[PDB]
C-alpha cells in the first residue's frame, strides 16, 4: 500500500526468482510439463537505486529463459554471491568465428550418427541424436580448462554419444571406431577378451581454436553397470593430481587434474554410487577440487518415464547433498549449453567445489538404433517427429543473423561427410584378418627372476626406532605407548607380529621411494586396535605418523616415497571403486584399500567383478590395487567371519590377480614387498586375520625378514629347522590360514609324529611345482586331507577339490574334505557352537 | 527501508536459523525492536522472539528447500507458534523411559562386562522419541509400525520399545538357548527382530509394533522394511494399491551418522519414495547422530554439513533436535508422524547426541578421539539432568525418582536370576534347515484348457476405442491363436502361468527394468493407446471371473527405478511381508544383479539359516551367450551355486516355456517359503523351436531332466547312444540341430533343468535308460570357471559316482569376463564347443 509496503514486496519478488525461478525457466526442448504502476518507481536493492522494470527483467533473463539455477540451498554466502554477479548481469554476445565453430561441433557430431546409420543399420551405437549440444558443450568445459592452464581433462561417461564424444572430443581416429563396426581388428585391437566399441576408452591433446593453450584429454574404460565408473574416475583423477604435487596432498592448490562425469537421467537418480561418491567430493583423503558433472537428460531411460525413475522434481536433486550449484539447460540453446559449461569450470576453478549441467534434451531414435520407442512412449515421438533438431535450428539462426550463407552451411556439411566415406572406404580396404577364439592375458605380466625382498637389519630397526621418535611435548596414549615399545624391542629382538610385519613392509617400501597409499574403515589406527599407522595426542589431538619418517634418508634427503593412510567414509563401492581408480592413475603406487570385515566387500561387487577381476582382459587397463579382508573363524557371527575366499578363486582365471592367505607376520611382509618391486601391474587379494594378530605363536625372527622370501607353500618349522622326520608320516593336511596354528598344536599335544601340516599361503595363481615338490618329500602318505574352518560350499574346496586332482593327479587323487558342513551362512551365530564345530575340524583330523 | 531489512531477516532465520540452533549437545565447535512491521501488523521484537524460538534454541527446521508450498506453510505454523508443554504425567512417562533406557544399559554392563551390546548410552533420548512416534501413530489410528534399525541401542528398543521379553534377552548373554532359539546356524543378538502390542499411557488406541531382522551390512534392510510395509499396506487395501489413502503401516528406519552419509543404498531407497509401485506413503527416520563412526571423525564421513543432507533430495523436511532435550525430542517425533499422515512424505529426524563408551563396550575411544571423550566425562547425562529439571519444577521428589530407578533395576536382577536358574542345555553344531520345509505330494500345476483360452482371449479383449501400436498388435492375435493352436512361446508361457495364479485368486507382483513391456519387446504386460497414450493391462481382466465375481487375485507389474540394491531388496521384503504373493523381480540383464550382492548375500540365499526369516522372492536373469559382451551374458550360475546349501533356494535354468509354467506355478502353489532363482533367455525367446504343446501345460508337470523328444515321442533308438552330452539351457538347441544336420545317431543330450536342488533320482533314472553310453560330457557354453561346471564337476562325481566318475568337461576356457567383447570371437568359440561335442 504504502512505499515502504511496496519495498518489502520487491525484496519477496527478488528472493523467489532467485530461489523457485528454475521452476519456471524454458529447459524444456520438447515442452510437454505490487501494481503495473509501480514498474517505473524506482527501489533500494542490494546498496543501489534500481527501478521495478529493470530489476524484474535482469531476474527474468537470469533465471525464467533457457537457463535454470539452483544456488540459494549453498551455505557459503560468498559462493550464493558470486553466481548472483555472473547470472543477474548482462554477459557478451559470442563472436561470428566462435558462433561458427559451434556449429561446426553441432555438424561434426550429427553427421557421425547419420553417416554410422547409412554404413551400419542393424549395429547399435547408442546415438546422441536429439543431444548433440554436449558436444560443443563440453568442447567449452576442456576450452574453458586449457583457458585456466589447467594440466588434464580426465572423463567418465555412460554409453550415450559415447563413439561421438571419442572421435569429436578425445580424438580417437574415424579408421578406428569404423573397424570395430566391421569386425576387422589387427592384433593390438583383438588382444585379450576385449569389451564392446562405447565402453573404451582414449587420450589426447585438445589444442585451443582461439587461444594458445593445450591440455591433456583422456576417457576412461567402464563397464554397461551404470554410473560405476563414478568413483573410479575420482581415483584416477586423486592419483594423478597427487603426481602432479597438485591439489589436497600438493604443494599447488590448483588442482590441475579435471574430473568431467557424464551422466543418463535414469542412472543419476537411481544408481547409489551416484550419492556415494558425491559424499567423497570434500574428504581429505578423496577430494579431487570439484568435479564437472554433465547429466545427458533425454527425459527417458529405455522405456521408463522420469515418472517411475524418481521421486524428485529433477534427476540431479542427490547433487545439492554438498552444496553443489545445478544448473539447468535448454539443449536446443547451444549457445547457453557453451555459456553454462564455462561458467561451471570458473566457479570449480574458484571454490574447488563440485558442479552440475542438467541438459535438457531428447532421444531422437529409441533406445538404441533397432529400439522402436512409440510403442511405450507414443506421445514423446509424436513431439519429437515435429522437432527439427539444434543443428538445423543453429544453422537457420546464423544465417538469419548474416553469419553464413546457405552453401556455406552446405559446403561444410559436405566435406565432412565427405571425410568420413573417405577413411570409411580406406578401412574397407584392408586385408579381412582370421578371426580366432579370445587368448588368456596371463603370459603378458612375466614374473621377473630372483627379485629380493628381504631387508638389512639396519631397516627393521629404523622403523623401529621411528615409533618412538616422537615430537617434542607429544603424550602417547598409555595404552598405545607399550605398542610402538614393543615395536622397537620386536626390530631389534625378534618375535614380530602381524601389525608391525605389514608396517615393516610398507615402510621399507617408502624408503625405497614408493608412494604408499593405505586406506579403509578406521584403517588409521586399525580395526582390532593394532596398526596405530596414525597415533593421537592424549592432551592436544595433534596427529603422529611413524613411518612418515622414512621418507627421509639420514642424511636429511627425502627417499621420494610417502605416506598416505586415511580414514575412509562409510562405504565399499566408492571406497573399492576409488582405490581401484587410483592404482590405475599412478601404476608406481603401493595402494591398499582395507575391509573393516571382509564380509563387507560384497558391498562393492560390481567393482571387484566388473573392474578389479576383468579389466586387463576386457580393456588392457591394468591396476595393482591391494585388497585386505579381515577373514577367520572366531564365533563372531555370520557378518564377522568370511571375506568369501570361494568367490575370488571363483573369479580368478588368466592369472589376473594374486590370492593369498598368509599365515606367517614374515610372510605377509615378502608378499606385500613382492607386490611393491615385481613390476607386475595385477591385484592381489589378501585374507588378513583378526585373532591371529595376538597369537604369541603367530610371530617371525629377524632372519626371515633379512634372510628370506616369500613361500607360497610352508612346511612345518619341524621338518625345515628342528629334528622332526618326515618319513614317519602317513597322514597329510593341507590346509591354509591360522587353523594351522590349531592343528600343531593338537599334533603337539597328541605327539602325533604321523601327521604333517602343508600350508598353501598363495591360493592362486596355485604353486603347482612348489606344491609337487613339497609333497615329494613325505614319501610313507598314504592319504591326504584339504583341512578348512569354512563350510564344505566356502573356502579354498570349492576350487581346489576340483582343480588339484586335475593338475596334479599323481599327488591328489582321492584327496579329501576336513571342514564345516555345507552352510547358507559363512558360519553361525553363536560363539558357542562355532567352538563345538572348529573342535570337530580338530577331532575328525586327527581321527 | 526498514521493512524490507525484516523480510530479509524472516527469511535468513527460515533459511539458515538450523545453523545457529543449539542442537549440539557437546558444544564441540565455537530503536526499530519497538516499531511496527507488516508480516498483519506486528513489533520487530515479538517477531525476532519467534524467529530465535523457533530456529535457534534445541530444534533445527530445514524445509526452504521443500517446493510444495502448502508444506512449507504446515510446517511454518506448528513450528512458529507457541507450543504448550507436557503435562506432569507426561513428563514423568518420558523420565519413566530414559530411566528404563539407562538402567538396562548399566544393568548389562554390571551383569556382562564381557560381551558387547553397543550400548545407546550418551543416546538414551532415542527410547521416549520412538515411544512418541508409536503413540503418535496409534493416535491417527495406524494399523502398524514397522521398524528397521542398526546395532546402536537395539538390544534397548527390543527390551523397551517392541517387547521383546528380558529372559530372552538376557538368555542370549548367557549363551542358554532351547531348541527353538537355537534353530539353524542363527545370528547375534543385536540382529534379531520381534514383534508386539503397543498400548497407549494416556490413550485408548493399539498399535502392532514389529522390528525387522538384519545383517552387520549398515543400511541394507532400508528397501527391505520398505518393501515389507508396502506388501502389508497392499493386503491391508490401504495406500496406493487400495480403497484408502491411508497408508495404515508405517516405516520407522533408524540410522548411525555415519552409515547414513555414506551407503548409497540409501539414496536408492529415498529415490523409491514416491514411486507408484514403491511408494509407502512416507518414512519416518530417526538418526542416532552420536557424532562419531567408530574411530571416523564426521569430517572424514561425509562432504556435506549434516549427516542427513541426502534426504533433501525427495524435499523431506529436516529437523535436528539435541539430545539432551528430551521434550524437544518428543514434540519433534509427534510433528513428524502429523506431517507423515498430512502429506503421505518421507520425514528426517537428525538426533544430535554423543556415544558414552567406546563404539564397543570393550573399545577404549580417548586412544583416537581425545578431545570428545574429555569433554562427555564432564557431561551428566539425559537422564540425571532430566531427573533434576523436573525436581526443580516440583513434579517429583529424590525420594520418588530413586525408588522408580529401584523398582526397575529390581525387576531387571529378579528376570535375571531366573535365567541363570534354568538348566543349561548341551551346545550342538548348527544343523542344516533343509528339512524345516517339506516338497509337497502329487502337487498338480496343469490347467484346463479353457484357461488357456481365457488368457488368450484377454489380451484381445481390448477397451472401446483402443488403438493398439502396429507392431504390438501381431503379438496379441498370435498369443489368442497360441492358446488355441498351440506352439507356445517362453513370453506368453510366464503371462500363462501368472494369469492362471491371478485367476486361482493369487496376487502377483512383477517388477524390474523396462519389465512391463520387456527388455526384448516380448511381454508386454502393459499396452499404450497409440493415440491417447492410455494403458491397458490384459493379465488384470483374469482378477474378474465370468459371472462378474472378484478372484481375489491382482496384478501388479511396474517399471522399476534404474537401481538393483533397492529393488532387489524391495522384493525380498515385499516377499517377508506378504508370503502368500507371487513376488517376482527381472533384472535387464542378469550381469546387473551382482549391484544387489549384498541382498543375495545377506537376505535370499541366508535369512531363513540366520533369522527364520521365510521369502519365496523370485530372481529373473536374462541369461546365455549371444555375443554382445561380457555385461550382456552371464546372470553368474557358478556364484547362486556355491551359495546354495541347507535346500535354501531352487536354481533353475528352463528351456521350454511349458517348463518354465510349471516351474512359476509350481512356486506359487506348492507353499515352500524358499526363493526361486531362474535363468531366463534372450535369443531364445523368438526361437521356433524352444516352443511348446497345449498338452504340455494341461496334462504335463515340471520335468527337472528333459530328454530329445525323439527319445520320448519320435522314433529315436537309446540303445544306439555311445556318447552322452549334458547340459542346461539354449545350448541343447545348438547341440540338437548339430545332431541332426549330421544324423548322429550315437550321441544324446540330457537337459538338467533344476540345477538345485540337484535331481539325484529323475537323473540317475534318466542315464539307466542309455544302457551303451561309453563316455559322459557336460557342455556349456560359459567358461570353465563359470556357469554349472565349477559346483556340477565336483558334485554329480560324487553324489552318483556310477554315473559320472570320468565326467569331462566341454566348456569355452577358463575367462575374467563372462564372455569376449566380440559377437565374431564369440560365434567362432561356440562353434569349436560344438564341434569338440560331436569330434
Ligand atoms: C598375478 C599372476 O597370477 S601372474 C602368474 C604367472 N602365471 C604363469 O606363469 C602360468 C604358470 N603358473 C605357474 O607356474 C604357477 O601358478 C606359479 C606362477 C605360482 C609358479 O609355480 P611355483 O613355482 O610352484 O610357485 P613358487 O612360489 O615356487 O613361484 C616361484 C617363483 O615365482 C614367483 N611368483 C609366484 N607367484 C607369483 C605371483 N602371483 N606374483 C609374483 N611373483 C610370483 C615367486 O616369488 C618365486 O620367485 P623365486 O623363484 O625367485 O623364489
Ligand atoms: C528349495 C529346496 O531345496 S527344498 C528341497 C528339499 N530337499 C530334500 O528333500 C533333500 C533331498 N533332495 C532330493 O530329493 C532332491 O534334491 C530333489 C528334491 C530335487 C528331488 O530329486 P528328484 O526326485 O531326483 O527330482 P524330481 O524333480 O523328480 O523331484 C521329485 C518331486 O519333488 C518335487 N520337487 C523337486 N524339487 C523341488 C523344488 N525345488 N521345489 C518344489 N518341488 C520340488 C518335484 O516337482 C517332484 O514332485 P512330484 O512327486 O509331484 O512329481
Ligand atoms: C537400464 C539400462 C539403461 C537405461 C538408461 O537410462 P539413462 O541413464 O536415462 O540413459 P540413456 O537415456 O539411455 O542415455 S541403458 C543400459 C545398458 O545396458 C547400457 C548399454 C551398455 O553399456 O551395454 N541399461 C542396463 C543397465 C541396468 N543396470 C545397470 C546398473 N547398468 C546398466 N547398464
Ligand atoms: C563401519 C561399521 C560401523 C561404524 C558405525 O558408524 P555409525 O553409522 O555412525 O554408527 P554408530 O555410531 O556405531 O551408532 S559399525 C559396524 C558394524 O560391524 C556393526 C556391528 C554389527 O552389526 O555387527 N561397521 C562395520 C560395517 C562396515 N560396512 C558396512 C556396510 N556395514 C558394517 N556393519
Ligand atoms: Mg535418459
Ligand atoms: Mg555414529
Given at each position: 500500500?504504502?512505499?515502504?509496503?511496496?519495498?518489502?514486496?520487491?525484496?519477496?519478488?527478488?528472493?523467489?526468482?532467485?530461489?523457485?525461478?528454475?521452476?519456471?525457466?524454458?529447459?524444456?526442448?520438447?515442452?510437454?510439463?505490487?501494481?503495473?504502476?509501480?514498474?517505473?518507481?524506482?527501489?533500494?536493492?542490494?546498496?543501489?537505486?534500481?527501478?521495478?522494470?529493470?530489476?524484474?527483467?535482469?531476474?527474468?533473463?537470469?533465471?525464467?529463459?533457457?537457463?535454470?539455477?539452483?544456488?540459494?540451498?549453498?551455505?557459503?554466502?560468498?559462493?550464493?554471491?558470486?553466481?548472483?554477479?555472473?547470472?543477474?548481469?548482462?554477459?557478451?554476445?559470442?563472436?561470428?568465428?566462435?558462433?561458427?565453430?559451434?556449429?561446426?561441433?553441432?555438424?561434426?557430431?550429427?553427421?557421425?550418427?547419420?553417416?554410422?546409420?547409412?554404413?551400419?543399420?542393424?549395429?547399435?551405437?547408442?546415438?546422441?541424436?536429439?543431444?548433440?549440444?554436449?558436444?560443443?558443450?563440453?568442447?567449452?568445459?576442456?576450452?574453458?580448462?586449457?583457458?585456466?592452464?589447467?594440466?588434464?581433462?580426465?572423463?567418465?561417461?555412460?554409453?550415450?554419444?559415447?563413439?561421438?564424444?571419442?572421435?569429436?572430443?578425445?580424438?580417437?581416429?574415424?579408421?578406428?571406431?569404423?573397424?570395430?563396426?566391421?569386425?576387422?581388428?589387427?592384433?593390438?585391437?583383438?588382444?585379450?577378451?576385449?569389451?564392446?566399441?562405447?565402453?573404451?576408452?582414449?587420450?589426447?591433446?585438445?589444442?585451443?581454436?582461439?587461444?594458445?593453450?593445450?591440455?591433456?584429454?583422456?576417457?576412461?574404460?567402464?563397464?554397461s553397470h551404470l554410473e560405476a565408473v563414478d568413483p573410479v574416475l575420482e581415483g584416477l583423477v586423486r592419483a594423478k593430481?597427487?603426481?602432479?604435487?597438485?591439489?589436497?596432498?600438493?604443494?599447488?592448490?590448483?588442482?590441475?587434474?579435471?574430473?568431467?562425469?557424464?551422466?543418463?537421467?535414469?542412472?543419476?537418480?537411481?544408481?547409489?554410487?551416484?550419492?556415494?561418491?558425491?559424499?567423497?567430493?570434500?574428504?581429505?583423503?578423496?577430494?579431487?577440487?570439484?568435479?564437472?558433472?554433465?547429466?545427458?537428460?533425454?527425459?527417458?531411460?529405455?522405456?521408463?518415464?522420469?515418472?517411475?525413475?524418481?521421486?524428485?522434481?529433477?534427476?540431479?536433486?542427490?547433487?545439492?547433498?554438498?552444496?553443489?550449484?545445478?544448473?539447468?539447460?535448454?539443449?536446443?540453446?547451444?549457445?547457453?549449453?557453451?555459456?553454462?559449461?564455462?561458467?561451471?569450470?570458473?566457479?570449480?576453478?574458484?571454490?574447488?567445489?563440485?558442479?552440475?549441467?542438467?541438459?535438457?534434451?531428447?532421444?531422437?531414435?529409441?533406445?538404441?538404433?533397432?529400439?522402436?520407442?512409440?510403442?511405450?512412449?507414443?506421445?514423446?515421438?509424436?513431439?519429437?517427429?515435429?522437432?527439427?533438431?539444434?543443428?538445423?535450428?543453429?544453422?537457420?539462426?546464423?544465417?538469419?543473423?548474416?553469419?553464413?550463407?546457405?552453401?556455406?552451411?552446405?559446403?561444410?556439411?559436405?566435406?565432412?561427410?565427405?571425410?568420413?566415406?573417405?577413411?570409411?572406404?580406406?578401412?574397407?580396404?584392408?586385408?579381412?584378418?582370421?578371426?580366432?577364439?579370445?587368448?588368456?592375458?596371463?603370459?603378458?605380466?612375466?614374473?621377473?627372476?630372483?627379485?629380493?625382498?628381504?631387508?638389512?637389519?639396519?631397516?627393521?630397526?629404523?622403523?623401529?626406532?621411528?615409533?618412538?621418535?616422537?615430537?617434542?611435548?607429544?603424550?602417547?596414549?598409555?595404552?598405545?605407548?607399550?605398542?610402538?615399545?614393543?615395536?622397537?624391542?620386536?626390530?631389534?629382538?625378534?618375535?614380530?607380529?602381524?601389525?608391525?610385519?605389514?608396517?615393516?613392509?610398507?615402510?621399507?617400501?617408502?624408503?625405497?621411494?614408493?608412494?604408499?597409499?593405505?586406506?579403509?574403515?578406521?584403517?588409521?589406527?586399525?580395526?582390532?586396535?593394532?596398526?596405530?599407522?596414525?597415533?593421537?595426542?592424549?592432551?592436544?589431538?595433534?596427529?603422529?605418523?611413524?613411518?612418515?619418517?622414512?621418507?627421509?634418508?639420514?642424511?636429511?634427503?627425502?627417499?621420494?616415497?610417502?605416506?598416505?593412510?586415511?580414514?575412509?567414509?562409510?562405504?565399499?563401492?566408492?571406497?573399492?571403486?576409488?582405490?581401484?581408480?587410483?592404482?590405475?592413475?599412478?601404476?608406481?603406487?603401493?595402494?591398499?584399500?582395507?575391509?573393516?570385515?571382509?564380509?563387507?566387500?560384497?558391498?562393492?561387487?560390481?567393482?571387484?567383478?566388473?573392474?578389479?577381476?576383468?579389466?586387463?582382459?576386457?580393456?588392457?587397463?591394468?591396476?595393482?590395487?591391494?585388497?585386505?579382508?579381515?577373514?577367520?573363524?572366531?564365533?563372531?557371527?555370520?557378518?564377522?567371519?568370511?571375506?568369501?575366499?570361494?568367490?575370488?578363486?571363483?573369479?580368478?582365471?588368466?592369472?589376473?590377480?594374486?590370492?593369498?592367505?598368509?599365515?606367517?607376520?614374515?610372510?605377509?611382509?615378502?608378499?606385500?614387498?613382492?607386490?611393491?618391486?615385481?613390476?607386475?601391474?595385477?591385484?592381489?587379494?589378501?585374507?588378513?586375520?583378526?585373532?591371529?594378530?595376538?597369537?604369541?605363536?603367530?610371530?617371525?625372527?629377524?632372519?626371515?625378514?633379512?634372510?628370506?622370501?616369500?613361500?607360497?607353500?610352508?612346511?612345518?618349522?619341524?621338518?625345515?629347522?628342528?629334528?622332526?622326520?618326515?618319513?614317519?608320516?602317513?597322514?597329510?593336511?593341507?590346509?591354509?590360514?591360522?587353523?594351522?596354528?590349531?592343528?600343531?598344536?593338537?599334533?603337539?599335544?597328541?605327539?602325533?609324529?604321523?601327521?604333517?601340516?602343508?600350508?598353501?599361503?598363495?591360493?592362486?595363481?596355485?604353486?603347482?611345482?612348489?606344491?609337487?615338490?613339497?609333497?615329494?618329500?613325505?614319501?610313507?602318505?598314504?592319504?591326504?586331507?584339504?583341512?578348512?574352518?569354512?563350510?564344505?560350499?566356502?573356502?579354498?574346496?570349492?576350487?581346489?577339490?576340483?582343480?588339484?586332482?586335475?593338475?596334479?593327479?599323481?599327488?591328489?587323487?582321492?584327496?579329501?574334505?576336513?571342514?564345516?558342513?555345507?552352510?547358507?551362512?559363512?558360519?553361525?551365530?553363536?560363539?558357542?557352537?562355532?567352538?563345538?564345530?572348529?573342535?570337530?575340524?580338530?577331532?575328525?583330523?586327527?581321527?
Amino acid at each position: 500500500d504504502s512505499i515502504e509496503d511496496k519495498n518489502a514486496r520487491v525484496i519477496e519478488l527478488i528472493a523467489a526468482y532467485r530461489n523457485r525461478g528454475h521452476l519456471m525457466a524454458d529447459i524444456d526442448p520438447l515442452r510437454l510439463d505490487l501494481t503495473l504502476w509501480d514498474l517505473d518507481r524506482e527501489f533500494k536493492v542490494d546498496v543501489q537505486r534500481k527501478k521495478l522494470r529493470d530489476i524484474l527483467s535482469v531476474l527474468r533473463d537470469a533465471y525464467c529463459r533457457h537457463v535454470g539455477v539452483e544456488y540459494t540451498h549453498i551455505l557459503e554466502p560468498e559462493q550464493q554471491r558470486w553466481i548472483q554477479e555472473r547470472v543477474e548481469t548482462k554477459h557478451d554476445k559470442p563472436t561470428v568465428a566462435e558462433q561458427k565453430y559451434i556449429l561446426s561441433k553441432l555438424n561434426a557430431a550429427e553427421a557421425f550418427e547419420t553417416f554410422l546409420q547409412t554404413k551400419y543399420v542393424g549395429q547399435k551405437r547408442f546415438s546422441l541424436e536429439g543431444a548433440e549440444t554436449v558436444i560443443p558443450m563440453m568442447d567449452a568445459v576442456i576450452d574453458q580448462c586449457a583457458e585456466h592452464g589447467l594440466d588434464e581433462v580426465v572423463i567418465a561417461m555412460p554409453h550415450r554419444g559415447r563413439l561421438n564424444v571419442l572421435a569429436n572430443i578425445v580424438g580417437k581416429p574415424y579408421s578406428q571406431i569404423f573397424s570395430e563396426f566391421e569386425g576387422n581388428l589387427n592384433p593390438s585391437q583383438a588382444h585379450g577378451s576385449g569389451d564392446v566399441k562405447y565402453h573404451l576408452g582414449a587420450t589426447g591433446t585438445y589444442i585451443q581454436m582461439f587461444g594458445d593453450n593445450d591440455i591433456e584429454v583422456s576417457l576412461t574404460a567402464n563397464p554397461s553397470h551404470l554410473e560405476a565408473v563414478d568413483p573410479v574416475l575420482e581415483g584416477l583423477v586423486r592419483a594423478k593430481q597427487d603426481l602432479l604435487d597438485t591439489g589436497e596432498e600438493g604443494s599447488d592448490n590448483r588442482f590441475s587434474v579435471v574430473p568431467l562425469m557424464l551422466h543418463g537421467d535414469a542412472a543419476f537418480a537411481g544408481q547409489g554410487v551416484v550419492a556415494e561418491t558425491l559424499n567423497l567430493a570434500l574428504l581429505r583423503g578423496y577430494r579431487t577440487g570439484g568435479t564437472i558433472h554433465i547429466v545427458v537428460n533425454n527425459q527417458i531411460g529405455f522405456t521408463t518415464a522420469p515418472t517411475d525413475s524418481r521421486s524428485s522434481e529433477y534427476c540431479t536433486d542427490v547433487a545439492k547433498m554438498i552444496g553443489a550449484p545445478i544448473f539447468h539447460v535448454n539443449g536446443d540453446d547451444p549457445e547457453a549449453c557453451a555459456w553454462v559449461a564455462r561458467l561451471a569450470v570458473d566457479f570449480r576453478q574458484a571454490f574447488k567445489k563440485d558442479v552440475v549441467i542438467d541438459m535438457l534434451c531428447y532421444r531422437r531414435r529409441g533406445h538404441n538404433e533397432g529400439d522402436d520407442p512409440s510403442m511405450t512412449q507414443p506421445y514423446m515421438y509424436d513431439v519429437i517427429d515435429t522437432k527439427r533438431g539444434s543443428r538445423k535450428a543453429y544453422t537457420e539462426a546464423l544465417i538469419g543473423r548474416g553469419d553464413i550463407s546457405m552453401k556455406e552451411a552446405e559446403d561444410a556439411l559436405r566435406d565432412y561427410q565427405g571425410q568420413l566415406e573417405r577413411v570409411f572406404n580406406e578401412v574397407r580396404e584392408l586385408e579381412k584378418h582370421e578371426i580366432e577364439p579370445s587368448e588368456s592375458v596371463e603370459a603378458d605380466q612375466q614374473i621377473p627372476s630372483k627379485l629380493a625382498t628381504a631387508v638389512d637389519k639396519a631397516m627393521l630397526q629404523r622403523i623401529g626406532d621411528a615409533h618412538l621418535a616422537l615430537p617434542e611435548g607429544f603424550t602417547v596414549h598409555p595404552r598405545v605407548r607399550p605398542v610402538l615399545e614393543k615395536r622397537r624391542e620386536m626390530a631389534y629382538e625378534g618375535r614380530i607380529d602381524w601389525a608391525f610385519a605389514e608396517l615393516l613392509a610398507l615402510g621399507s617400501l617408502i624408503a625405497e621411494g614408493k608412494l604408499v597409499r593405505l586406506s579403509g574403515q578406521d584403517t588409521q589406527r586399525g580395526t582390532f586396535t593394532q596398526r596405530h599407522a596414525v597415533i593421537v595426542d592424549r592432551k592436544t589431538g595433534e596427529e603422529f605418523t611413524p613411518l612418515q619418517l622414512l621418507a627421509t634418508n639420514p642424511d636429511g634427503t627425502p627417499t621420494g616415497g610417502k605416506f598416505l593412510v586415511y580414514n575412509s567414509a562409510l562405504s565399499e563401492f566408492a571406497a573399492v571403486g576409488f582405490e581401484y581408480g587410483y592404482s590405475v592413475g599412478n601404476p608406481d603406487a603401493m595402494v591398499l584399500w582395507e575391509a573393516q570385515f571382509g564380509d563387507f566387500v560384497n558391498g562393492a561387487q560390481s567393482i571387484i567383478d566388473e573392474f578389479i577381476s576383468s579389466g586387463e582382459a576386457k580393456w588392457g587397463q591394468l591396476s595393482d590395487v591391494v585388497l585386505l579382508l579381515p577373514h577367520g573363524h572366531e564365533g563372531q557371527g555370520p557378518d564377522h567371519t568370511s571375506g568369501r575366499i570361494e568367490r575370488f578363486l571363483q573369479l580368478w582365471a588368466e592369472g589376473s590377480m594374486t590370492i593369498a592367505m598368509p599365515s606367517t607376520p614374515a610372510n605377509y611382509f615378502h608378499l606385500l614387498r613382492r607386490h611393491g618391486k615385481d613390476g607386475i601391474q595385477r591385484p592381489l587379494i589378501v585374507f588378513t586375520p583378526k585373532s591371529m594378530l595376538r597369537n604369541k605363536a603367530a610371530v617371525s625372527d629377524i632372519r626371515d625378514f633379512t634372510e628370506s622370501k616369500f613361500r607360497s607353500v610352508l612346511e612345518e618349522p619341524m621338518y625345515t629347522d628342528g629334528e622332526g622326520d618326515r618319513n614317519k608320516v602317513t597322514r597329510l593336511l593341507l590346509t591354509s590360514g591360522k587353523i594351522y596354528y590349531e592343528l600343531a598344536a593338537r599334533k603337539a599335544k597328541e605327539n602325533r609324529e604321523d601327521v604333517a601340516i602343508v600350508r598353501i599361503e598363495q591360493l592362486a595363481p596355485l604353486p603347482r611345482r612348489r606344491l609337487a615338490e613339497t609333497l615329494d618329500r613325505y614319501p610313507n602318505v598314504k592319504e591326504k586331507f584339504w583341512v578348512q574352518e569354512e563350510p564344505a560350499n566356502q573356502g579354498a574346496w570349492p576350487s581346489f577339490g576340483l582343480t588339484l586332482p586335475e593338475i596334479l593327479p599323481d599327488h591328489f587323487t582321492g584327496l579329501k574334505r576336513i571342514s564345516r558342513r555345507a552352510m547358507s551362512a559363512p558360519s553361525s551365530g553363536s560363539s558357542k557352537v562355532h567352538a563345538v564345530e572348529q573342535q570337530e575340524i580338530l577331532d575328525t583330523a586327527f581321527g
